[PDB]
Amino acid sequence: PFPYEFRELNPEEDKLVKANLGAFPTTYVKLGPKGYMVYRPYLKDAANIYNMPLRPTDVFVASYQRSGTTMTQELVWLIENDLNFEAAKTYMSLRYIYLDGFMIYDPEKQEEYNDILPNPENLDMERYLGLLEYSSRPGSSLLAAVPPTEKRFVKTHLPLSLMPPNMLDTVKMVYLARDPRDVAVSSFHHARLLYLLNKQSNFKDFWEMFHRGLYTLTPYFEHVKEAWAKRHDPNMLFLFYEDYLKDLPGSIARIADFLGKKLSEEQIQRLSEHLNFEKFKNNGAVNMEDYREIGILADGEHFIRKGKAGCWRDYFDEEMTKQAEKWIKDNLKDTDLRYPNM
Amino acid sequence: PFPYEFRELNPEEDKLVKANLGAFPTTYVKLGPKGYMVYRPYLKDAANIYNMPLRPTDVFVASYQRSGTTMTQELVWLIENDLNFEAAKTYMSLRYIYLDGFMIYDPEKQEEYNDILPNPENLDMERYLGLLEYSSRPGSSLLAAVPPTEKRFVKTHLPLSLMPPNMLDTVKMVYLARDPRDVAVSSFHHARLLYLLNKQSNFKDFWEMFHRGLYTLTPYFEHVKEAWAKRHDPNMLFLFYEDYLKDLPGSIARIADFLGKKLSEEQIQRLSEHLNFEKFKNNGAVNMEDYREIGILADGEHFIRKGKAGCWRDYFDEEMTKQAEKWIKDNLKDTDLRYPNM
Ligand SMILES: Nc1ncnc2c1ncn2[C@@H]1O[C@H](COP(=O)(O)O)[C@@H](OP(=O)(O)O)[C@H]1O
Numbered sequence: 001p002f003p004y005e006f007r008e009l010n011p012e013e014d015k016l017v018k019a020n021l022g023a024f025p026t027t028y029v030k031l032g033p034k035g036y037m038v039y040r041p042y043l044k045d046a047a048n049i050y051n052m053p054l055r056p057t058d059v060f061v062a063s064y065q066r067s068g069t070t071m072t073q074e075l076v077w078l079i080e081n082d083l084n085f086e087a088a089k090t091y092m093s094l095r096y097i098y099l100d101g102f103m104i105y106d107p108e109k110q111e112e113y114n115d116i117l118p119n120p121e122n123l124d125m126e127r128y129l130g131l132l133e134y135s136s137r138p139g140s141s142l143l144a145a146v147p148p149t150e151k152r153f154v155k156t157h158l159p160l161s162l163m164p165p166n167m168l169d170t171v172k173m174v175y176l177a178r179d180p181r182d183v184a185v186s187s188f189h190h191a192r193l194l195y196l197l198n199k200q201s202n203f204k205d206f207w208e209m210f211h212r213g214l215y216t217l218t219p220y221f222e223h224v225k226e227a228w229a230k231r232h233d234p235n236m237l238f239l240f241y242e243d244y245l246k247d248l249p250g251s252i253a254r255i256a257d258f259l260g261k262k263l264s265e266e267q268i269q270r271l272s273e274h275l276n277f278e279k280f281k282n283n284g285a286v287n288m289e290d291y292r293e294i295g296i297l298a299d300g301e302h303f304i305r306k307g308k309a310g311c312w313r314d315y316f317d318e319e320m321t322k323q324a325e326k327w328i329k330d331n332l333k334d335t336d337l338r339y340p341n342m
Numbered sequence: 343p344f345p346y347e348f349r350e351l352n353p354e355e356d357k358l359v360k361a362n363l364g365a366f367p368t369t370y371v372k373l374g375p376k377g378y379m380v381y382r383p384y385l386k387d388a389a390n391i392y393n394m395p396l397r398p399t400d401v402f403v404a405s406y407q408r409s410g411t412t413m414t415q416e417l418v419w420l421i422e423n424d425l426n427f428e429a430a431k432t433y434m435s436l437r438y439i440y441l442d443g444f445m446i447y448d449p450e451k452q453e454e455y456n457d458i459l460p461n462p463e464n465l466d467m468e469r470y471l472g473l474l475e476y477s478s479r480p481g482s483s484l485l486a487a488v489p490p491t492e493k494r495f496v497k498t499h500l501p502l503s504l505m506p507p508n509m510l511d512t513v514k515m516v517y518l519a520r521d522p523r524d525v526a527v528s529s530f531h532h533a534r535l536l537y538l539l540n541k542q543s544n545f546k547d548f549w550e551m552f553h554r555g556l557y558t559l560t561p562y563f564e565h566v567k568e569a570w571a572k573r574h575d576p577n578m579l580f581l582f583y584e585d586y587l588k589d590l591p592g593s594i595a596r597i598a599d600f601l602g603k604k605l606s607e608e609q610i611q612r613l614s615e616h617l618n619f620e621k622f623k624n625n626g627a628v629n630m631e632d633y634r635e636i637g638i639l640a641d642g643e644h645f646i647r648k649g650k651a652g653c654w655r656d657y658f659d660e661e662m663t664k665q666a667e668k669w670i671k672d673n674l675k676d677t678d679l680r681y682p683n684m
C-alpha cells in the first residue's frame with residue numbers, strides 16, 4: 001500500500017547532478033511529494049520498507065548522513081549491551097543492519113562499478129564480490145533475517161516518511177542532526193572516499209548540488225524537520241552532533257536515560273574516553289579501514305576524518321556563505337528548529 | 343592612413359534595417375566604396391585593424407559568417423597543435439581571437455542591451471559584465487597582447503579590403519564560402535539566437551535585407567569575390583562549406599597540406615570523426631552553450647544548428663526563389679566563381 005510516486009530528474013537537475021556524479025553508474029529519482037533523492041535500486045524495496053514488521057526491542061539510529069551516526073551507534077550498542085567492550089570489538093557493520101545501504105548498488109551495472117577504481121587489478125576479488133552480493137540484498141530482507149531472540153540494532157539515513165508511520169509506537173529511535181554546512185563538507189569527502197565524484201568537480205559544485213536538494217536523501221531540512229516534529233515522543237531522542245563536542249558525558253547520560261539504563265559516573269567517563277576522536281578513528285571495529293584492504297576506498301580520505309564543528313568556513317567563499325545564510329534562514333522561518341552552535 | 347570613408351544609411355535603406363534590427367541598440371554605417379555594413383563601433387578600430395602588425399606564424403580563419411568558420415577553427419587548431427585533442431578541450435573563444443567581435447557592442451549604450459532579453463533578472467551578472475568588458479576591448483589590441491612566443495589564431499568575418507593590403511605576404515588564411523541562400527537561413531536563426539531580430543520579423547524580411555546588402559558585413563558577393571581573387575596565392579586556402587559535407591577527409595587533407603603538415607590516412611579519419619556533426623554540436627568546447635548559462639541565448643536556437651546544405655528550399659517561396667536565382671546569376675556573371683552544389 002505504498003502511497004508515493006517517483007519522478008525523473010528534469011534537465012537543470014540532471015546537469016547539476018552529472019557535474020558531480022556523472023560517471024557513477026547508480027542514478028537518482030525523486031520520491032514522494034518532498035522529492036527525496038534515492039538511488040534507483042531503492043524502488044524495488046521501497047514498499048517493503050514502508051511495511052516492514054517491527055518489534056518492541058528494535059532500536060534505530062537515524063540521521064541525514066555525516067551527522068554523528070557512527071558515534072551514536074557505538075554508544076547505543078554498548079549501553080544496551082551492559083558496557084561489554086570486548087563484544088563491541090566486532091565490526092559495526094555486523095552489529096547493525098544498514099537498512100538503506102543496498103540502494104547505492106544496481107546489480108544490473110556490476111561491470112560499471114569497478115571501472116570507477118584507478119587500480120581494479122589490486123582488488124581482493126573474493127571480498128569485493130562478497131561485498132557486491134551482500135549489497136544486492138534489500139534492506140528489508142536483512143532486517144527480517146535476524147531471529148526474534150536477537151535484539152535488532154538498525155542504522156538508516158531514510159526519512160521518517162519512508163518508514164512505517166507510527167513506527168515509534170513499537171521501536172526506539174535516536175536521531176542525529178548537524179549544521180548542514182559541516183554536513184555538506186563531510187558528505188563531499190565521504191563521496192570522494194567511495195569514488196562517487198568526478199575528480200574534476202570541486203566542493204562548490206558539491207555544495208550547489210547539496211543545498212538545492214539534489215544529493216542522496218535530501219532535501220536536507222525536510223529530513224530533519226520530520227524527526228524534529230516527533231521529538232516529543234517518548235520513543236524518540238533528537239540529538240545534535242555539536243552537543244557531542246560540547247558535552248560528551250551529558251549526551252551519553254541522556255542516551256542511557258532514554259534507553260532505560262542507569263549508568264554510574266565511572267561508566268559514562270569510560271564511555272566518553274572510548275569515543276575520544278583519535279582513539280575512535282584508530283578503532284578498526286568502527287573506522288571502516290577493513291574496506292581499504294578490499295581496495296575500494298580512495299587515498300587521502302577516511303571515514304572518521306576530523307571531528308570538528310565550524311570548519312565549513314574553510315571551504316565557503318563569501319558567495320556560498322550568503323547562499324548558506326539565506327537557505328538556513330528560509331528553512332528556519334515559521335519553526336522552533338534551532339541549531340546549538342548557530 | 344585609412345583610405346575609406348563611411349556614410350549613414352539613406353531613408354530607404356534605414357526603413358528596411360529598422361524593420362528587422364531596430365530594437366537592437368547598435369546601429370550600422372556603410373564603410374568604403376563597396377558599402378560593407380559595419381556596426382558603428384567598428385570605426386574606432388578600423389584604422390588600427392587596417393594597419394595591424396602581423397607575424398609570420400599568424401593563421402586567420404575568415405568567412406562571411408555562418409559559412410563553416412567554427413569547424414574550420416577546430417581543424418586548423420588541432421593540425422597546428424599536433425592533434426593534441428586534450429588541449430583542444432578549452433573553449434574556442436580562448437583559443438582564437440575574434441578580430442571583429444567587438445563591434446557589436448557600444449559601451450555608450452550599456453544600459454540598453456539587457457532590455458532586449460525576456461528575463462534580464464536571470465543574468466549571471468558577473469559573467470555578463472565580464473563579457474561586456476571583454477567586448478569593449480578593440481580587436482587590434484587583443485591581437486597585439488598575445489606574446490610573440492605564442493601562435494596567434496585569428497577568427498574574422500572582415501573582408502580582405504578592411505585588413506592590411508598584402509597581409510597574405512605574411513600570414514596564412516583559410517577562407518570559407520557557402521551557398522548564400524543557406525548562409526541567409528543560418529544567419530536569420532543566429533540573429534534570433536543573440537536576440538538581434540525583432541520577434542515580429544520573419545525570414546523573408548531577413549532575406550530582403552540580406553540579399554540587398556544591408557545585413558552585417560554584406561554585400562555578400564563582394565566579400566567572397568575578394569577572397570576568391572586571392573585563391574592561387576600560396577597563403578590563401580579558399581574552401582566551400584559544401585565540400586565539408588561531400589568529402590570531409592579531402593578537405594582536411596587540403597587544410598593540413600596548406601599548413602605544412604603531412605598527415606596519414608589514420609590521422610585524417612580521426613579529425614573527421616571529431617567533426618561529426620552530432621558529436622561537435624554536443625562539444626561544449628565549441629557549441630557556445632556556455633553563454634546560455636550567462637542568460638543571453640534565445641530558447642530554441644543553437645550556435646551549432648542542423649549542418650545541411652540545400653535546406654534553404656524549406657524557407658523560400660517561389661518568388662523569393664527566383665529573386666535569389668536572379669541575384670546569384672547577376673553576381674556570377676563574368677566571373678569564374680562557382681559553388682559545388684549549385
Ligand atoms: N568519536 C567521534 N568524535 C567526533 N566526531 C566523530 C567521531 N566519530 C566520527 N565522527 C565524525 O562524524 C562525522 C560522520 O558522521 P556519520 O557517522 O553519521 O557518517 C564525521 O565528521 P567530519 O567529516 O566533519 O570529520 C566524523 O569525523
Ligand SMILES: Nc1ncnc2c1ncn2[C@@H]1O[C@H](COP(=O)(O)O)[C@@H](OP(=O)(O)O)[C@H]1O
Nearest residue numbers: 408409410411412528617619622646647648649
Ligand atoms: N561539424 C559540423 N558539420 C556540419 N556543419 C557544422 C558543424 N559545425 C557547425 N556547423 C554549421 O555551420 C554553420 C555555422 O558556421 P559558422 O561556424 O561560420 O558560424 C551552422 O550551419 P546551419 O545553421 O545551416 O546548421 C552550423 O550548424
Ligand SMILES: CC1=C(/C=C/C(C)=C/C=C/C(C)=C/CO)C(C)(C)CCC1=O
Nearest residue numbers: 065104105113116131132135194195296
Ligand atoms: C561505493 C561502492 C560500493 C559500496 C559502498 C558502501 C557499502 C558504502 C557505505 C557507506 C556508508 C556505510 C556510509 C555511512 O552511513 C560497492 C562495494 C557496492 C561497489 C562499488 C562502489 O563504488
Ligand SMILES: CC1=C(/C=C/C(C)=C/C=C/C(C)=C/CO)C(C)(C)CCC1=O
Nearest residue numbers: 407443446447455456473474477536638
Ligand atoms: C549579443 C550581445 C553580446 C555579445 C555577443 C557575442 C559575443 C556574439 C558572438 C557571436 C559570434 C561568435 C558570431 C559568429 O562568429 C554582448 C554580450 C556584447 C552584450 C549584449 C548583446 O546583445
Ligand SMILES: [Ca+2]
Nearest residue numbers: 111112114115
Ligand atoms: Ca568492469
Ligand SMILES: [Ca+2]
Nearest residue numbers: 453454456457
Ligand atoms: Ca537595462
Ligand SMILES: [Hg+2]
Nearest residue numbers: 308309310311
Ligand atoms: Hg573549525
Ligand SMILES: [Hg+2]
Nearest residue numbers: 650651652653
Ligand atoms: Hg536539405
